[PDB]
Every structure is written in C-alpha cells, then in structure tokens.
Design a binder for these strands. Structure first.
Ligand SMILES: [Mg+2]
Length: 470
RNA sequence: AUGGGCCC
RNA sequence: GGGCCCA
C-alpha cells in the first residue's frame, strides 16, 4: 500500500512478546535453516543495520494508480470473471441473519469464540465472549450499536497490528522480515459475513479450476481432482507474486468490489460498502498510527476469497492487455490467495506479461528456481501449490500432496509448550505422502518419547478418503 | 488474526 | 473447547 500519515499518540497498544515456539528434540538433529521470527527490536539474532519497525512496514511501497483505459479494462475483466463465478454458484447471495453469520452455514465455519477482539475492545481488556453469545447466535449492546452504525454507513474503525509469531527461514529472520497480522474489530468481521457469507460458503463448496479457487479444498482428497485436470495441458506455470496482499491497488480493489458484489447478483447494497472500507485503513502499532491507502488487511473476513478473486482477475487483465481474443477459457487456473497455478494449451509468454501485472503494482516472478525467465513446457508434477507437490501415488495411481522434506523438518523442529504430541499427530498426516522411508526418518527423533502413528495406519486412512472404493 | 482443511 | 498445517 501507500503510507500517507505517521503520528505518535500516548494511547499505547502492547504486542511486544517473546516467542512461544520452543525447539524440539528434532532441532538438535535436523539443524534447519529455519527459526522463529524476531519479535523484539533488540533481538541478538538480528543483522547489523536492521530495525524491526522499519522492515515491518517496508512492504508499503506505494498505491499504484491506474489510467482510465486500464481501469475500464480491469472493469471488463472483473465483470467477465463475476459472470463466470455467479453462473456457477448461482445468485443466492441474500444476507445472513446475525445467527447465521455467527454459527455459520453449510460450508462456512462458525465464527471463532476466543480469538482477539480487535480495537477498541482490546484496550478495554474485554474478550470476544464479553460482546457476543457464540452458543445462541446473538450479540450484546455494543455490537448492535456498531451494527446499526454500519447499515447507516457511519461506522469507522482502526486495525490492530500483531507481529506474527511463526517459523521463518533464517535469512529472513536475520533481515528482520517478520510478517504482520492486521486484526479488525470483531463486529466488522460479523457484518462482512452477514453481507457476503452466503457467497463465501458457496465459493467454498464449489472450489476447483472452474471458479479458479482452491479455498475450501482438502489437499489429501482434492489433489487427485486438481492433478488430473492440470495434467491435460501443454503448459503449466508456477507464478510467484511479491507481497501480493499489500500491492493490491485502490483502483483494482474498488473496481473488483463494484463488479463482483452487485445487487443484481443478489447482494445487499452494503456488501460493496463494507468491502470498500478495506481500501483506506488505520493501523495501530504500540504508540504509532499509520494511515494506509491500498492493500488488503490480513485478518479481515473473506481475506482469502478477496485475494483469490483478485488473482483470477489479474491473470485475465494481464493477458488481455498483451494479447487479443483472450477469453476465460483461453486458459485455466486455480488460486488460494497469492498462491496460483495457471495452465493453457496456448504458448503464453509470462515473461512479456511482467509489465502488465506491473500496472496493478504486482510483480510476478517464476516460482521455479527463481530461474532467469518464465519457461514453457512445464507440467503439474513440476509445480507447487499450498507448499505441496503433485506426485503420483505409486500404488493407487492417484496424485498425492507431497511436502518438501526440508520443510517438514523445519515444522517438526519447533513447538509450543505442551503441544508436541498433538502436533506430531497432525504433521503425520502431511508426512505420510513422503513415503515409508522418509516418514520413518522424519519421526525417528521422537521415537520412545511420543506416540508416532504408523505409516500403514495413515496410508490406509488416506486411501479411503481419496476413494471409498479401492 | 481472516479463513480453509485436518487432528484429538 | 484444545492443537496443527497451508494461503
Ligand atoms: Mg505456488
């Protein structure tokens, strides 16, 4: 985005924190080029000539403004995508009752009961349960007041900046490249769900290449689906963006909301309005306050859906800006936020597409090696989606989601106090797909101390999940 | 944190 | 309810 104003106020928002990630019995064994991100400015692991607060916000490098010609072309692409999207989902996009938007609906999880409540409730130390009844699907007086102030479109708010406590590659840990989370107030989240939840749930249950969205998918079973689909194309591309989320420009964001969430598609008028409040945002960070124009907040309801939509639109816009006759089935793609796979029988030149993405302030680079240039001729067994490869399971013939061994080692090397056993069982469902030998090697540091699920027990579970028959 | 999926 | 992983 674009930082337009930075001011210091007395009302402090404390987030400091040491890490909650302790090394495991495996860190002494795997020695991963990974560690927890730095969360204090006096971290000994930091480089010389690095400040946390400067690198934290160093992603906001400007809000790319668009020409009339480019704005109108984005609007056609947004309309054309919306058209395909709504024809597959239906136009059954009526608002959610308060109850619905809390407890969820078929294909939309229930709101989180005990996650951060956001501002200004965080400064009053009032937990999320203090404001909403998550059993009965009703809201307290403070939320109904904001709710009525959202219908009337007067509602203001500030985002709360959290430093993300997670494992990062040491190169980035040392560079102070800690990722940030932007917590919106819990009433904003509820109202957004009211406005676009019925859309969101329908997105989820219809995930696939057809709507170009993997949000709602389950890699274990859905890998076979995605695999076979992309298998039948002459060209496949693993495209990386660089800070996809922050680089969404006002114009693109705004135009996307105007074309996708139209009342003619059955959306409440305030659907467009609620989503547009994400464009110009106030972020709170200890003493400082940052007014930003552009970019997506990570923490808004429907963040992944918005990113995926925008992604689907970016590819169309970029291709149409370079070629002629390009229509939705000139190509195929699936995305989950920034993460994307594109395919086509045509020989598209992504290298030439670079500057077209650049007009939306997006920088595309090949995922593959970061090799000098986008190449042609790649297949699905060459690419990565959601940190998983597409590999053929040697004994069911089905595609399986395989994670890089180095990644799995990193994961297994750190855990929060008293969460190790639990975590080992979870990670096991991810590691099974690496094969018996590699499954054994990965968990061997934990032998004799924790319960390790057998390879066999988890392969058998997977086979049933992917196909009830074989 | 938003969410998705999964695990108990 | 508590956890994990991915974006
Ligand atoms: Mg990828």
């Amino acid at each position: 985005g674009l930082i337009v104003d930075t001011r210091d106020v007395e009302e402090r928002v404390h987030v400091m924190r040491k890490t909650k990630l302790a090394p495991t019995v495996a860190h002494g064994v795997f020695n991963p080029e990974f560690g927890p991100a730095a969360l204090s400015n006096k971290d000994p692991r930091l480089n010389e000539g690095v400040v946390l607060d400067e690198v934290i916000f160093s992603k906001h490098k400007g809000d790319t403004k668009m020409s009339a010609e480019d704005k109108a072309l984005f609007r056609r692409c947004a309309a054309d995508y919306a058209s395909r999207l709504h024809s597959v989902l239906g136009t059954a996009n009526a608002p959610l009752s308060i109850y619905e938007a809390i407890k969820g609906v078929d294909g939309l999880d229930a709101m989180e009961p005990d996650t951060a409540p956001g501002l200004p409730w965080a400064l009053q130390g009032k937990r999320r349960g203090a404001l909403i009844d998550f059993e009965n699907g009703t809201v307290g007086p403070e939320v109904e007041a904001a709710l009525k102030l959202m219908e009337k479109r007067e509602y203001k708010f500030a985002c709360q900046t959290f430093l993300k406590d997670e494992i990062r590659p040491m190169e980035k840990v040392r560079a102070g490249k800690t990722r940030i989370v932007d917590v919106l107030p819990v009433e904003h989240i509820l109202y957004t769900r009211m406005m676009i939840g019925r859309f969101c749930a329908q997105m989820h249950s219809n995930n696939g290449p057809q709507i170009g969205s993997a949000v709602g998918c389950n890699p274990d079973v859905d890998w076979q689906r995605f695999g076979t689909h992309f298998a039948q194309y002459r060209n496949v591309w693993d495209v990386d963006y660089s800070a996809f989320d922050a680089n969404h420009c006002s114009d693109a964001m705004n135009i996307m909301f105007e074309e996708v969430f139209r009342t003619e598609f059955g959306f409440h008028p305030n659907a467009e309005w609620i989503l547009k409040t994400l464009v110009n945002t106030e972020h709170a960070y200890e003493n400082k306050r940052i007014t930003v124009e552009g970019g997506m907040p990570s923490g808004c309801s429907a963040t992944s859906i918005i990113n995926t939509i925008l992604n689907n639109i970016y590819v169309l816009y970029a291709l149409r800006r370079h070629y002629e006759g390009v229509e939705l089935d000139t190509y195929t793609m699936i995305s989950y936020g920034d993460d994307i796979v594109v395919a086509s029988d045509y020989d598209l030149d992504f290298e030439a597409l670079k500057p077209h993405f650049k007009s939306l302030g997006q920088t595309i680079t090949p995922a593959d090696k970061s090799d000098k240039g986008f190449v042609l001729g790649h297949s699905i067994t060459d690419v990565t989606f959601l940190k998983r490869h597409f590999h053929m399971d040697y004994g069911t013939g089905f595609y399986k989601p395989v994670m890089a061994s180095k990644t799995l080692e990193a994961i297994l090397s750190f855990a929060r106090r008293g969460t190790i056993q639990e975590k080992l069982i979870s990670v096991a469902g991810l590691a099974v797909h690496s094969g018996p030998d590699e499954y054994r090697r990965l968990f061997e540091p934990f032998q004799g101390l924790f319960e390790i699920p057998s390879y066999r027990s988890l392969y058998l579970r997977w086979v049933n999940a992917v196909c009830g028959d074989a």
